[PDB]
Nucleic acid binder design. Structure first.
Ligand SMILES: [Zn+2]
Ligand SMILES: [Zn+2]
Ligand SMILES: [Zn+2]
Length: 116
DNA sequence: GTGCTTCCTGCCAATAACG
DNA sequence: CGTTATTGGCAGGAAGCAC
C-alpha cells in the first residue's frame, strides 16, 4: 500500500508507513513486508527470522561457511562481495567494479537456491 | 577514522500461478 | 499449457556498529 508521485515525466511509488520511494512497485512490495510481516523468512539452521528472502539466504551462507567469491589474481576465496572487493583493492590495487572481470562468483553448492 | 557486518533496491531470469 | 504474475539473486553503495 502506497501512493504515486509523478515528477516531470517519472513515476515513483511511495510507501505509506515510512515514505521511502521506489522506481518500481515490485521493490515497494518487497520492502513493505518489513512493516506487515505477512511473509516470514526463517533460517533453517537457527532461530532467526528475516523480513526478506535474500537476507535469510545470505544469513544461511554464513552457517555453512561456503566461500563463493574467488579472486582471479591469486585464487583466494571469500564469503561475500564486500570481502572479495576489499581484498582486490588493498592487495591487488584494482577495482573489481569494472571492466575486468577480476573475480568469479561460484554457483551456490552448500545449499539449494535458484540457479542462474 | 578503520574495518567488519548487514541492509537496500533497480534490474530481470527463474519459477510459479492461473484459468 | 501458454501466458500473465511473483520471487528473489546479484552488484555495489549505504547504513549501522564495535573498536
Ligand atoms: Zn516503508
Ligand atoms: Zn541462522
Ligand atoms: Zn587476490
Amino acid at each position: 500500500d502506497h501512493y504515486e508521485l509523478i515528477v516531470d515525466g517519472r513515476v515513483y511509488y511511495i510507501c505509506i508507513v515510512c515514505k521511502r520511494s521506489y522506481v518500481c512497485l515490485t521493490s515497494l512490495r518487497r520492502h513493505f513486508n518489513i512493516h506487515s510481516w505477512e511473509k516470514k523468512y526463517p533460517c533453517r539452521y537457527c532461530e532467526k527470522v528475516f523480513p526478506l528472502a535474500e537476507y535469510r539466504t545470505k544469513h544461511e551462507i554464513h552457517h555453512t561457511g561456503e566461500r563463493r567469491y574467488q579472486c582471479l589474481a591469486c585464487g583466494k576465496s571469500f564469503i561475500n562481495y564486500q570481502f572479495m572487493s576489499s581484498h582486490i583493492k588493498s592487495v591487488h590495487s584494482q577495482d573489481p567494479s569494472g571492466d575486468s572481470k577480476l573475480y568469479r562468483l561460484h554457483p551456490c553448492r552448500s545449499l539449494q537456491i535458484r540457479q542462474y
